[PDB]
Subunit: 295 residues, 4 copies
């Protein structure tokens, strides 16, 4: 037998960093959960229980704390680059570092219409993430994304014209509720190394912002009979607005809301045009995915 | 042996209701999870396996759907009252109904600066709930509350002057991070029945909005060395701003952020006045509670 | 305005303790989650921001570790009592201590038929808990319980003869699936103090064992048309087997498994006597509760 | 822009199936959660909102129920294969089917030392899963696995001899607690079609059983100072005991238990040789992985 693959590292490293502006007195907070996995000439730890080739996970944790102390933790795309680069550069037997960052929301509070200098609210469970893969002599690969975005539109969504056979029972419809969680990932073009990445820093937040906006607006405005069709529209726009992205990927799990027939009770009318009360379903759920790249 | 207590019913009934303005076109959505537990002359179902006295849990379900169909589901306090009352009135052997209602956020989206007619976002996992106890001959007891509000303030909190003994290792502090989930409950004065409730409808949404604003503002503005002191101030204002409320209750589960000493590494300074990076702690956590009523 | 109530403390204190037997070389582990909430003359922390009356939550933490270090952590009823007692005894202004303990399963592993000296497996998400209320000059009240016990029986469960009216659509049945989580609490007769508690130590593990056995066996054996009727039988037996218990309380959340009509497809028969494939329902669910105590009759 | 990749389907389909022995009276249950994702000539749904190429997710759900009704649902490897094969055979435009199945434990109850005919207990949150890829012309790829197996050994584990630099603070140790959730997967050698699979049916349950036993035994018995080392030994034995397996893959998320220094209190001894009470850490946690194959 032989080791075909191997990674090890620290997961769920919660980090919090505050930024204070001495002048204005305004404080800004950043809180993420970090995961670093190393790859390299570490087989013998597996085959001959050799720990000499092992950088302790505990130390990988220390390293995350120290790196965050001495560098900007935002955008996450930068921080992940800086961090993964450190691993390949400081150790001769480490050849690849895979950094995953999840950024949690700490929205500044508006008290009396003015933004509070140092008070935040977790205004949603939505997350902004990055998966940075820094490989030796192969550059830096960055996948950015947003996840945990939950939306619903009460109308302006239909589903008809789908295949029908002896397994079909679903009725066609020209008005329905559409609710989903959005998971949207945009892959950047390979970067040669840290410098190239620093050069593009402003593109990061911008693109995130753009991707969010596009998703929300398109979801709201599109009156479609295809979730597939809608996602694709989203993709296109993102690709159009940022040349440095190679692919865009969308995963939408479709949360269903069923009509409740109440006719059996005093001929109560609650379906079709009369539907008012529905039963949200916890499961199962449709799942639609797609990766869209350039022609 | 004897039955000293007994309740049964249906839990986790998910309900969705839409409101359509034919004129303006604007739609509005309401989603909530409902639990209804009944009390009455049911012993015999326990003692002699007699099902005759049992209104099925499935029918309690149907009832919820039917009630929602034919009544306003907002405010929650009203809906809970209508629902509870239904049970004690329609059944001779049923003498108490306990209705729990958890309301989920479906905040209308702003596209391009304008509120969208029919598109919503789950803009937070915070919930607005109500526990409504409808007891025969005793009227209607309503507990209203907000939960799942998570907040953080990077400074303007201290802790010092606490009891010190042989079990004490905590160091006193004049600048610390304060984060907590907020669970706030205000109890209304007993209502005589459905009509007295209906008469007060406007106070419900109004009080909720007050309770929340007071909480947010006081948290942000108070620079205290007592979370206890802060919670108390919150209570006072709420009781002050609304005569019909008998008690206000707060439960704050603290979330600790620890300082990380990095001095062992190149004498890096990251504590006291230099603290920048902190370690968010998943557990354990402080838990402070208190019920405040009128003098 | 005035403070009508007030409790503060530390929640979610995770604790693990190992016991070694130097002779046999066998090792035993205990892991629980602990919450301690204090009550007393502390109003001033709320009204006048006075921290002098506050034992810091961090110190409540240290105290749990230290107590765990110098005392048995089992049974949890004992530990909780020792722990609660400590707070009222060491502070003059603290009059009540409420300790909640959740015990986690770390079941010894059987390797090649033989119990392993030091290896364990989390063989289930069922918990054994205790709620211990130590109030000054009012003794020690103990509520013991098991939770997170999930069971299912594929048959020998019915539901018919229930009230029918204009809200009813449920069809009567003589064979159905019964699945539930079991939450069972037995409340002990008040104890004067730590001594009384120590004197009854053996009763603890035994009653827990009994409660669990009675629940499983009754559930399995009872062919009922009432979950209520089944819970009630369980209560009785527990009460019968232990005189020091004042009340038994059961809370069973009923998880439903629907029948799936497939007749629309090639006249497929999957209902009634031919039901084989069901759709388990995540929600909603029935919830049945009841507290049973001892009769005043003779 | 162009559609580089696209799948869609039904997630979280809970299915329950009972087996009744008319002779013995003994019943047996099976509960699993199923996900089916289809791949094929479906681009147009994305690009031209064409639903004619879309087999409704609902119908995929109906199919799962139907298939379960007319086929064995055990071993999952088989069911998955039958299920995925159905999709590529019945639809001309569908060329891939990806079926995921999670199996929940419903262990038979021992009442008075005798196995009960129809009573079960969820005796663990440990799962047995399968991922079955059915690609037209490419055969059937099956990954089998066990997950959610949590274990802890109080002693007979050390960690010393690992790399030490300026980022290191971890002390070496000759006795330490070792706890971890185990996620173990074994990949089968490609099968040509449903028949080849049918022909190996018995190997499925047998290998699952072996994989489990090997993992428990090795974990218990191995006195190592390398989790990497231990994992490896587990994989070797699994490969050794079953020729049809191509690779075995372990993911071990290490759960830490810290020592608690209590010396500051009346010189209490609770470290090193005297360690009795420990603080289990919720996070962060080490994570070791590795894929082992044949030399
Ligand atoms: O009691 C306590 C303990 C810690 N921090 C507070 O604000 N109060
Ligand atoms: O009341 C009820 C209703 C359904 N099923 C039960 O066991 N009890
Ligand atoms: O394929 C499908 C099925 C259901 N609903 C959609 O939007 N797409
Ligand atoms: O690197 C490490 C650290 C802790 N435990 C392991 O198995 N490996």
């Amino acid at each position: 037998s032989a080791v075909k693959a191997a990674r090890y590292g620290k997961d769920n490293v919660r980090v919090y960093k505050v930024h204070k502006d001495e002048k204005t007195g305004v404080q800004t907070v950043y809180e993420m959960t970090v995961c670093v996995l190393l790859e390299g000439e570490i087989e013998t730890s597996y085959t001959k229980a050799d720990n000499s080739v092992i950088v302790a996970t505990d130390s990988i944790k220390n390293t995350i704390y120290i790196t965050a102390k001495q560098n900007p933790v935002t955008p996450p795309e930068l921080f992940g680059s800086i961090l993964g680069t450190h691993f390949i550069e400081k150790y001769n037997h480490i050849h690849a570092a895979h950094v995953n960052i999840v950024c949690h929301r700490w929205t500044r509070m508006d008290i009396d219409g003015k933004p509070h200098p140092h008070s935040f609210i977790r205004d949603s469970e939505e997350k902004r993430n990055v998966q940075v893969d820094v490989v030796e002599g192969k550059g830096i690969d960055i996948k950015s994304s947003l996840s945990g975005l939950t939306v619903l539109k009460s109308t302006n969504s239909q589903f008809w014209g789908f295949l029908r056979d002896e397994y079909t029972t679903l009725k066609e419809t020209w008005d329905r509720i559409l609710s989903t969680d959005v998971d949207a990932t945009w892959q950047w073009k390979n970067f040669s190394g840290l410098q190239e990445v620093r050069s593009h820093v402003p593109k990061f937040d911008a693109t995130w912002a753009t991707a969010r906006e596009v998703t929300l607006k398109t979801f709201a405005e599109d009156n479609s009979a295809s979730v597939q069709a809608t996602m694709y529209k989203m993709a296109e726009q993102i690709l159009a607005r940022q040349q440095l992205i190679e692919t865009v990927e969308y995963s939408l799990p479709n949360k269903h809301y069923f009509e409740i027939d109440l006719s059996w009770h005093k001929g109560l009318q609650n379906t079709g045009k009369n539907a008012e009360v529905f039963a949200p379903q916890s499961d199962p759920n449709g799942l639609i995915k797609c990766t869209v790249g350039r022609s």
